[PDB]
Design a protein around this nucleic acid. Structure first.
Ligand SMILES: [Mg+2]
Ligand SMILES: [Mg+2]
Ligand SMILES: [Mg+2]
Ligand SMILES: [Mg+2]
Ligand SMILES: [Mg+2]
Ligand SMILES: [Mg+2]
Length: 224
RNA sequence: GGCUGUCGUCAGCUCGUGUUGUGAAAUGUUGGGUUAAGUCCCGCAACGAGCGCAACCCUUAUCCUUUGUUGCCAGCGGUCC
């Protein structure tokens, strides 16, 4: 990544001054038009070091998970995870995914069974009434947990967009002792994150830049 | 002990794991619609399950296949009708 490359993507833009958490005063360069500006000169090295640690942990062959739930970036996180060979969650995070995994395993199994029934030639003996509810259940289950259908255990690293919106996941990770790699805007609390990446978290361009950089770095980490 | 009345055939009553609180406890079971119904859908720190509601049981209302006695008489013949 480069300062020139990411300055054109509008990363430095933050939120309104009325909303800034004081927990990240150092990360703010200044203000303009009553809107904060994020400092590039420090967000570059921390991002690079996070990427280094990330592909280092990837080379150990460790599964990782991408949390991004805004309706404007579900497609981007899905694309990164798919062309990453790694996993994702792109809808409402069901509380207790990590800390209550021994229960969500059952829903994973049910989704697998129902997918086999659907794409195995079974949804024709049903009397056009319960087949529809089976399809409805399929759609709900895949939209809620389709990106984690093959954990086979807890992950190792958990990557989050907009740490503030995803406090449940960060708390899950802190409870279970799993490192967190998150992007925080000028209104979040970075205490639960041990690898803080300052910057915007809602603009599509910045989100795409983050996801592309992470997907690349982890591909070269896996190829190692 | 067993059996029965009653609230009341009212729509409610709970549990496992997770989270919150020093604790008694809370959540789920709250919210928007909807229903005869905690009935269903959408949201959601909750994710699921059990007993209840509904369906499976008996009867009544239409049609068809089979058998025609002690039951029936449309078309035939006779008749004390
Ligand atoms: Mg406690
Ligand atoms: Mg509450
Ligand atoms: Mg209650
Ligand atoms: Mg309660
Ligand atoms: Mg409701
Ligand atoms: Mg029910």
């Amino acid at each position: 990544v480069s300062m020139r490359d990411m300055l054109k993507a509008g990363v430095h833009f933050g939120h309104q001054t009325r909303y800034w958490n004081p927990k990240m005063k150092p990360f703010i360069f200044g203000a303009r038009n009553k809107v904060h500006i994020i400092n590039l000169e420090k967000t570059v090295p921390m991002f690079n070091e996070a990427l280094a640690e990330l592909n280092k942990i990837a080379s150990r062959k460790g599964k990782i998970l991408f949390v991004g739930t805004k309706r404007a970036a579900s497609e981007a996180v899905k694309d990164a995870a798919l062309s990453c060979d790694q996993f994702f969650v792109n809808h409402r995070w069901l509380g207790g995914m990590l800390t209550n995994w021994k229960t969500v395993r059952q829903s994973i199994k049910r989704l697998k069974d129902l997918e086999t029934q659907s794409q195995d030639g079974t949804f024709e003996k049903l009397t056009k009434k319960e087949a529809l509810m089976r399809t409805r259940e399929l759609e709900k289950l895949e939209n809620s947990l389709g990106g984690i259908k093959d954990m086979g255990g807890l992950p190792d690293a958990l990557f989050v967009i907009d740490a503030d919106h995803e406090h449940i996941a960060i708390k899950e990770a802190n409870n279970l002792g799993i490192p967190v790699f998150a992007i925080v805007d000028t209104n979040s609390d970075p205490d639960g994150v041990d690898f803080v990446i300052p910057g915007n978290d809602d603009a599509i361009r910045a989100v795409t830049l983050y996801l592309g950089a992470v997907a690349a770095t982890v591909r070269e980490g896996r190829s190692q």
